[PDB]
Amino acid sequence: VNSFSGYLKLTDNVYIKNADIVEEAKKVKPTVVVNAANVYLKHGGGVAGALNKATNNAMQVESDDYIATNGPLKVGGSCVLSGHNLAKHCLHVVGPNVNKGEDIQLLKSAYENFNQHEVLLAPLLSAGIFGADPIHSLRVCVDTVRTNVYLAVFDKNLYDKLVSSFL
Numbered sequence: 001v002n003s004f005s006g007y008l009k010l011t012d013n014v015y016i017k018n019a020d021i022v023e024e025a026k027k028v029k030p031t032v033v034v035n036a037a038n039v040y041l042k043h044g045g046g047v048a049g050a051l052n053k054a055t056n057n058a059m060q061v062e063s064d065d066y067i068a069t070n071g072p073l074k075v076g077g078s079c080v081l082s083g084h085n086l087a088k089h090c091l092h093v094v095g096p097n098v099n100k101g102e103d104i105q106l107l108k109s110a111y112e113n114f115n116q117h118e119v120l121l122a123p124l125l126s127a128g129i130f131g132a133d134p135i136h137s138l139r140v141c142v143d144t145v146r147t148n149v150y151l152a153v154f155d156k157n158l159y160d161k162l163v164s165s166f167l
Ligand SMILES: O[C@@]1(CNc2ncnc3[nH]ccc23)CCCOC1
Pocket: 019, 020, 021, 022, 046, 047, 050, 123, 124, 127, 128, 129, 134, 152, 153, 154, 155, 158
């Protein structure tokens, strides 16, 4: 039993809710919140920009030190950093960004990072400003993640379509 509330149950391990991931994380304080990161951990917009704003830019400061030490992530890769005031940990995961011409096949690799964590609050990878079809992203999530994932979909209109079209 966990403290995630109000989710629709898509599968054995995947749950979905129309919610702002920022407001969700502040309420639940999960062990892990997933950020929709880019390889530079530049959290300018989308989910990343919003999560960073909620940390008062502490996420960006930590991220800049991480990059200065380690260099950029790989597309499809991840790193574990602090969750600041939102969660114990933040798993920064880089899905392919279609608006940059990145290979959508790397989306499965991106979701594989979730399997290293027993429970996660997460967005749909490569959705929103990363330009991929959120229906496809949900499909890959369900077919790749085996740990317990609580998906937050910000757009209510998108949330209803994801449920109504889920096979
Ligand atoms: O752009 C989308 C992804 N963005 C977010 N997802 C969850 N919570 C969020 N809070 C702020 C942004 C944000 C909107 C939701 C559906 O997929 C694309």
